[PDB]
Design a protein around this nucleic acid. Structure first.
Lengths: 104, 77, 96, 91, 96, 99, 87, 108, 92
DNA sequence: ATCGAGAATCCCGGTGCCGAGGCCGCTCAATTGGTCGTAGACAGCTCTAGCACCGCTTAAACGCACGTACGCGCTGTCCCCCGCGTTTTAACCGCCAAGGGGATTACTCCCTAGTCTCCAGGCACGTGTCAGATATATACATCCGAT
DNA sequence: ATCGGATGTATATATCTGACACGTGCCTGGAGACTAGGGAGTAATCCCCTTGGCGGTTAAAACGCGGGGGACAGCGCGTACGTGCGTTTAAGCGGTGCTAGAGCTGTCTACGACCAATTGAGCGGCCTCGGCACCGGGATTCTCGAT
């Protein structure tokens, strides 16, 4: 069996426990910690890819590319708040013009 | 060498930044700013490289330099 | 929800809401803006284009493309009304 | 040899958007993102243990670190997912 | 002959360069600059090719973000022309 | 004999010299402390504070608003205004990335 | 057994002249009358964030009393590190 | 046994090499902590501490006080470019601010 | 019950830079905060360096590097010289 | 414009106090000083990816002209905010009281580090299909005089 | 305001190539089944510092009133930067080829975790006195309405 399958996760609980121990984050790591963490990472992964796939589907493209990740992350308030200082390689920027700059 | 960051290349950056009109003193100012920005990232990246006893600067050396300055860059990690 | 999900929407003439607001409403509702007189599902203006029967609105008429007021989209956003009601109770054109 | 998260990311992608694929650059960004969020939560969970003189990161240090790091509905929903998972895993 | 008015093509460029994602500085002169700056902190270096790409992505992103802040400072002054004082303000508010 | 009056802004400059020389906490202790309790009860009912925890909150707040006012002041001066206005605060916060 | 009645409007406890004094320390010569409500808005947003984190450190400790350390840790993680209350 | 000798006194430091070595282990920073590391770190802490108190005592003397107080720490820090660069995101309790009026605000 | 602080070492250093000068308890509390902050910055960075290079041991080399990253310019060169001079003395 | 009041500031000096420097117990944590296992320093090898350099294309940078719309110095004038006198209200201080809960000690048992044995997961690396990059012609979307 | 022209754009259709999705073999790390000892959950006791409350003084807040100086609208005009052309150069590409050095491998020894016995160093408390704060009175600075 596997700890991921007992949790019902796709994320790798076994690997997460080993990385928590090996990173020297603490003297000890309780069995529930990597389960909770793998669940949280999986959820945030799904929450980004939800939006990134919508951005791709807004467009004609069928595969996610860095542009779609940037548009997703900056359109969503809470992801932009979580990732405010992050730069995404090949993201570009949001389509954005200040109204004062237009004709009339 | 810094004059190799061409006038139109700075205009393109300002355009991506949404800037409509650009007073010509901006180019030399921006060249100054950019050189300071590169000096701090390169000096940190080179410090990671030299710590590791390498001569070749890795992508990870640049990523760690940016990450410690909080300009965290994804996609190369 | 997105009522205009597959629909093309022509904008003609004067609008009280500017072009980008009307385009933003069309996008938020899931539809597609155009300026081309003969390929839309809906046509949009103030009263003026039908009130004058301007040459572009005569093309909309010969295309039988039904016409709604600019502010009728505000109801398409603001209420649970069916598409037919939003294009019958709300209509400018005598054709459609 | 070189471990990553890429296949679990791909399995999550298959759950949220079955038809969608993902470019290699985008997959590299997901590996970057997962490692960042993991390092944030693990760093903060560590600091929580030291401030309370605890030796152990338990699920509760994770839960608190998550409540600290995430804004608003991401925080509320993430905590629910952690609660669901640890509940399901316990039996 | 025909001519666009001042500012029309600048707006056309803003839309273009905000829509695309390519790096905007020519690769080779940026790479050449990076070598000159590195040479002072240590002689006889080498770079991974990807490492110069990471630096270019960083510099272009940082400068673009700085130009957005600079744009606000000019607009606040009721200018549309950015000027060195705007960069100096934005950087000083950022605490650089 | 007309009463002595300083011309406008002259006493404001003297206040700046005074309140930059001194290190006193400028917000009234007790109203600040009531504001802390009033906010706190939105997250958890019937909380308590170490008295020093309230002092630390005030020291943070005074430093934070003072710093923001310096940036606001630069924004006003850059627009050739002497007078600070809400658009300066909105600008200073947006360039800081607090919004 | 006891309780206290819920506190209301204590944001207006941040007096007009207190805001003026902060601006004077900040080097401001002239203040437009619209600044005060805007400033109260900013201060309330700042305090909400610092308190939410500090209360979370207090809850994590299973304490009911917010300590100076809870506040210092909140400020530290928000990148506004305060010396004079730690140690 | 030989007479006990503090690692601080071998290094010529005032700072506690012993306590620093303890904290480097118990802070979980690594599996292992090499015997020179606490000496090097203690020397660096000591140097920076001396560098601040150097300037702070000068500011207290200039303000004609024999005792360093939080005000002098703030003034001494904001008067040095590299300390202010090291501490740009630090708030000092009871510090106040630098005496500074923007030149345009002064009367004609 | 027993606390610990840097306060006596702070006091010793004070007597060396300025013999005549005293220090307030609040100023001493600030120095204890500062010493702990800088200790945690340096040790934190030294941990990352060790981890990035798969080294399990923090050594003087990781500290010397962490200092060149954290401190500005001349303050760094002096700190690195002091750290070096202390270790060569301690090696005796 | 340079010159008298006058108002606030900066400056002596007697008081008198409580915060800082010092001194003493003494508890414990740093040191002394013994194993021993392994992290990592070092040597050797190997192969890949960074640097060098070459010739040709053609995209991009450059330099030039020109005109227009912007920046901005100038004036008016309107009203807001500052400075100053009065009223009032609540912040502040001292002191009083109860008891919530923060800190500590002591148990005991749950669980998590740790070892060993097993096997399936997930990686490295083949490979063929098709998403989307690159035209290429096309049908708009929107700008600019000219009316 | 409309309207025509133009011209820059986003749109269908067609190919085609190289990136990604899937299939494979395998090797090593997770996971199953132990063991055992110490981390931290729970009880119980203490006392401290917090929260509530009261009465009195007087500092600060709120308020009202001028009035002058600042914000900001309007605007005349000098110029500096946008749009566009013809020019030229250096970036790019795809080539080759070399070799430094990043990477993995194998050995072995230097050191740092470990334990334990031991003792001075740093902390917790009690002082006591002098650096500072506090008025009280004083001289100096700077401002303003005269000129």
């Amino acid at each position: 069996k596997t700890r991921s399958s007992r949790a019902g996760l796709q994320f790798p609980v076994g690997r997460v426990h080993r990385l928590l121990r090996k990173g020297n984050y603490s003297e000890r790591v309780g069995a529930g910690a990597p389960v909770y963490l793998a669940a949280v990472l999986e959820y945030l992964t799904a929450e980004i890819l939800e939006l990134a796939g919508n951005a791709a589907r807004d467009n004609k493209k069928t595969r996610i590319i860095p542009r779609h990740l940037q548009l997703a992350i900056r359109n969503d308030e809470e992801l932009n708040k979580l990732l405010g200082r992050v730069t995404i390689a090949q993201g570009g920027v949001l389509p954005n013009i200040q109204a004062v700059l237009l004709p009339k | 060498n810094i004059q190799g960051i061409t006038k139109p290349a700075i205009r393109r950056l300002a355009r991506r930044g949404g800037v409509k009109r650009i007073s010509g003193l901006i180019y030399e100012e921006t060249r100054g700013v950019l050189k300071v920005f590169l000096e701090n990232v390169i000096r940190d990246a080179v410090t990671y490289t030299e710590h590791a006893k390498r001569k070749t600067v890795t992508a990870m050396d640049v990523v760690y330099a940016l990450k410690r300055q909080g300009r965290t860059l994804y996609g190369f990690g | 929800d997105k009522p205009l999900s597959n629909m093309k929407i022509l904008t003609l003439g004067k609008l009280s809401r500017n072009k980008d607001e009307v385009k933003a409403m069309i996008e938020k509702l899931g539809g597609k803006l155009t300026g081309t007189a003969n390929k839309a599902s809906l046509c949009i203006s103030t009263k003026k284009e039908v009130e004058k029967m301007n040459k572009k609105m005569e093309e909309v008429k010969e295309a039988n493309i039904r016409v709604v007021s600019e502010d009728f989209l505000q109801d398409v956003s603001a209420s649970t009304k069916s598409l037919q009601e939003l294009f019958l109770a709300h209509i400018l054109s005598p054709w459609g | 040899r070189k471990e990553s998260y890429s296949i679990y990311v791909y399995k999550v992608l298959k759950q949220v958007h079955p038809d969608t694929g993902i470019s290699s650059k985008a997959m590299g960004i997901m590996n970057s993102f997962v490692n960042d969020i993991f390092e944030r939560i693990a760093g903060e969970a560590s600091r929580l243990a030291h401030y309370n003189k605890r030796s152990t990161i338990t699920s509760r240090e994770i839960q608190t670190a998550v409540r600290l790091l995430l804004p608003g509905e991401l925080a509320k929903h993430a905590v629910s997912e952690g609660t669901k998972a640890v509940t399901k895993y316990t039996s | 002959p025909h001519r666009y008015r001042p500012g029309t093509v600048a707006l056309r460029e803003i839309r273009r360069y905000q829509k695309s994602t390519e790096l905007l500085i020519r690769k080779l002169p940026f790479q050449r600059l990076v070598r000159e700056i590195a040479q002072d902190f240590k002689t006889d270096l080498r770079f991974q090719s990807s490492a110069v790409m990471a630096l270019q992505e960083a510099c272009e992103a940082y400068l673009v973000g700085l130009f957005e802040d600079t744009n606000l400072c000019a607009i606040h002054a009721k200018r549309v022309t950015i000027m060195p004082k705007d960069i100096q303000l934005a950087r000083r508010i950022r605490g650089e």
